[PDB]
Structures are given as C-alpha cells and as structure tokens.
Amino acid sequence: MIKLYGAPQSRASIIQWYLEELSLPYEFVNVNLKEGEHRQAPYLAINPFGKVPAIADGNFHLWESGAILLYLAEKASTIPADAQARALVNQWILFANSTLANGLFIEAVREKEMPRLLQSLEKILGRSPFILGEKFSVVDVAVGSILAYVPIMLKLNFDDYPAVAAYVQGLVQRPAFQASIGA
Amino acid sequence: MIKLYGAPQSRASIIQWYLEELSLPYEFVNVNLKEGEHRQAPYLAINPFGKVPAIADGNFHLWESGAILLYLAEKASTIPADAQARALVNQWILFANSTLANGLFIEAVREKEMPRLLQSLEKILGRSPFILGEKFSVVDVAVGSILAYVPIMLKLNFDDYPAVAAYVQGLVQRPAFQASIGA
Numbered sequence: 312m313i314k315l316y317g318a319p320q321s322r323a324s325i326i327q328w329y330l331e332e333l334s335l336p337y338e339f340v341n342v343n344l345k346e347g348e349h350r351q352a353p354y355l356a357i358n359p360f361g362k363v364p365a366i367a368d369g370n371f372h373l374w375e376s377g378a379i380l381l382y383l384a385e386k387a388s389t390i391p392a393d394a395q396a397r398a399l400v401n402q403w404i405l406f407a408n409s410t411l412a413n414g415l416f417i418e419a420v421r422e423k424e425m426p427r428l429l430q431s432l433e434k435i436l437g438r439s440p441f442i443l444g445e446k447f448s449v450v451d452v453a454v455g456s457i458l459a460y461v462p463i464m465l466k467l468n469f470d471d472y473p474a475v476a477a478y479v480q481g482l483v484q485r486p487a488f489q490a491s492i493g494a
Numbered sequence: 495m496i497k498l499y500g501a502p503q504s505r506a507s508i509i510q511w512y513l514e515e516l517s518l519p520y521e522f523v524n525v526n527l528k529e530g531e532h533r534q535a536p537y538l539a540i541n542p543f544g545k546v547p548a549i550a551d552g553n554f555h556l557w558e559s560g561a562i563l564l565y566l567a568e569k570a571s572t573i574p575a576d577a578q579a580r581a582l583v584n585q586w587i588l589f590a591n592s593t594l595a596n597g598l599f600i601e602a603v604r605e606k607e608m609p610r611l612l613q614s615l616e617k618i619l620g621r622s623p624f625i626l627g628e629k630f631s632v633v634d635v636a637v638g639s640i641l642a643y644v645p646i647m648l649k650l651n652f653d654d655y656p657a658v659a660a661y662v663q664g665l666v667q668r669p670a671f672q673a674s675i676g677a
C-alpha cells in the first residue's frame with residue numbers, strides 16, 4: 312500500500328485529507344523532524360531535500376505535496392485524461408503551492424497580494440460551488456487546504472469574502488477533512 | 495503557434511527558453527505590468543489572478559509557469575508516459591516553484607534553507623550532467639532558471655558548490671537560453 316512520510320502539523324495532513332476523500336488505505340510513517348531524522352541518510356534516500364511529505368508506492372518514491380496530490384488523482388482516475396485536462400489541474404496545484412501560499416503567508420507581500428487573491432477567488436467561488444465547477448476535486452484539496460490554514464496560522468478571517476468563507480466552511484465540515492486536518 | 499504572454503524581466507522568459515529548446519515557434523505578447531495591463535479585463539480573462547506568464551494554444555489557455563512547462567513537455571513527448579514518469583517531472587517543477595525558490599529568495603529563511611538546498615543539488619549534479627541524468631530536460635529549465643537568477647538578484651555565487659556552478663554556467667551558454675533569458 313501507499314506509505315506516507317509525515318510529521319505532526321505538517322503538509323502531510325493535506326495528503327491524508329485526499330487519501331480520506333479517495334477512501335484509500337495507507338501506512339503513516341512518522342519522521343521525527345524535531346530530532347533531525349529527516350536530515351539522515353535513510354530519509355534523504357526518499358527525499359534528498361529532507362522535507363515531508365513524501366510517499367513510497369512499492370519501489371516508487373515521490374516528494375512535494377503537490378506532486379503527490381496529482382499522482383494520487385491520476386491513479387484514481389477512471390476516464391483517461393489528455394494533456395489539457397491534466398494541465399488545468401496542474402495549474403491549480405502550482406497556484407496553491409506558490410502564488411497563493413506566498414501571497415497569503417509571506418509577510419512582506421501579504422498586504423498587497425492577499426486581498427487581490429481573495430477578490431479573484433471570490434468571483435470564481437461566487438459562480439460555482441467548487442474551483443473546477445459543480446464537483447469537488449483534488450484542486451479543492453490543494454487550494455482549500457491553504458485557505459483553511461489562514462484562520463489557523465494568521466488569526467485572519469474571510470468575513471469580507473462571503474463566497475470564499477462559505478467554500479472554506481463547506482470544506483472544513485466534510486467528514487474526510489475532519490478526519491485529517493481538522494482532527 | 496503557441497501565444498506566450500510575458501513582460502520584461504519576468505518568468506515568461508523561462509517558457510521562451512523551453513520553447514527554443516523544443517525548436518517551437520511562438521507569438522510573444524508583452525503585457526505592460528508597469529501600466530497595469532495585467533489588471534485589465536482582457537488579461538484577467540486569461541489569468542484571473544493577473545500574473546504572467548500565460549499561454550494560449552488555440553482556444554486553450556493556461557497559467558502558472560510550472561503548469562505551462564509540464565504542458566509543453568507532455569505535448570512534445572514522443573513516447574507515452576504513465577503517472578509515475580509524469581509524477582517525477584511534476585515533483586521537480588513543484589520543487590522549483592516552491593521549496594527551491596522560497597529557500598533561496600526569502601530573506602527570513604535563506605540562512606538555514608539555502609546551504610541545505612545547494613548541498614543536496616551539489617550531490618545530484620556531481621553525479622550526472624543534468625538533474626534527471628545524462629539528458630537535458632524540462633526539469634533543468636525549471637530548476638536551472640531559479641539557480642541562474644541567484645547571482646543576478648542576491649549578488650551571491652556558487653563558489654562553494656562547484657557542480658552547481660558548472661551546471662549553471664553550462665545552461666547560461668546554451669543557444670536557447672541565450673535566445674531567451676540571456677537576450
């Protein structure tokens with residue numbers, strides 16, 4: 312089965328949320344970051360940059376939370392996808408991992424970037440329940456996890472963005488979220 | 495041909511580098527960021543977050559430099575790839591856009607992150623000429639572009655990382671790099 316390498320209150324929880332959504336079994340392997348386990352040869356053979364999360368699926372190893380989400384989404388897919396359908400999913404995962412996370416969590420750029428990001432998301436989320444339309448997808452795990460960390464880590468709220476606020480509330484109340492990030 | 499939306503001294507040059515490596519033509523369209531053209535309705539209809547680069551491939555539009563690189567790499571592949579082969583490339587593109595760029599360019603984390611990132615890259619690059627092995631790939635465009643920007647923006651060098659220094663020197667001398675980032 313999939314082995315997920317993670318640590319307490321790390322991005323491995325985002326992978327656990329998607330595994331809960333997909334109803335897939337997995338082994339959780341704790342990596343003791345406080346004691347430097349991630350900086351030793353055994354973990355560096357899984358991720359040479361010593362970061363969690365990572366997965367092992369047999370002899371295959373993979374790191375970067377965004378690449379793990381895309382991999383799990385592809386493996387679970389029932390209808391074959393083309394380069395354009397994968398590209399739109401990749402776009403949102405890259406956005407969550409760079410443009411969005413940076414604009415919200417980098418103090419030097421937050422005042423300018425955060426309102427613009429949320430204003431753009433408000434327009435999108437006001438027209439459809441999920442980022443890609445009527446159906447929940449891996450994009451909502453990627454983008455939604457970053458947004459859900461705003462109240463948790465910055466003590467900020469989405470009161471000025473009602474569609475964003477309702478979207479994040481809807482994700483937080485999903486049983487799969489409550490069994491992972493929300494636990 | 496692909497339309498590439500870019501701006502002076504921006505990440506659109508990374509896409510232009512890869513298009514030149516693939517010997518593909520493209521129609522370059524400047525977006526005047528200094529005059530707020532990226533915040534006007536025509537550009538917001540391409541990228542709702544008002545960032546360059548973006549591409550149009552016929553009626554298909556795509557934003558996030560990393561997603562564009564993955565899309566062009568998929569489109570230019572002659573041998574069909576499975577989820578694991580795509581995942582390894584996705585891993586490096588996410589790394590370049592998050593872990594690597596943040597660890598090098600965010601002042602508050604640079605002291606701890608930068609030597610760790612460079613030491614890991616030094617070990618990989620000391621064993622093979624390119625990140626994935628013997629052959630140059632889209633991963634070298636993604637990672638190499640970020641590393642090439644280190645001397646320019648931070649006034650730092652790779653004197654203590656000789657394989658990183660020789661790898662970057664090699665990339666900067668490539669004709670496709672000179673026709674794009676080096677132009």
Ligand SMILES: N[C@@H](CCC(=O)N[C@@H](CS)C(=O)NCC(=O)O)C(=O)O
Nearest residue numbers: 321322361362363364375376592593
């Ligand atoms: N872009 C990476 C970031 C991973 C990351 O920063 N992981 C942290 C924990 S949340 C880590 O392993 N830190 C250990 C260290 O930097 O020494 C991803 O999304 O997977």
Ligand SMILES: N[C@@H](CCC(=O)N[C@@H](CS)C(=O)NCC(=O)O)C(=O)O
Nearest residue numbers: 409410504544545546547558559560
């Ligand atoms: N993660 C994005 C970042 C894109 C980005 O930051 N682009 C800048 C280039 S200057 C931009 O368009 N800035 C305009 C703005 O932020 O208003 C990518 O890699 O494409």
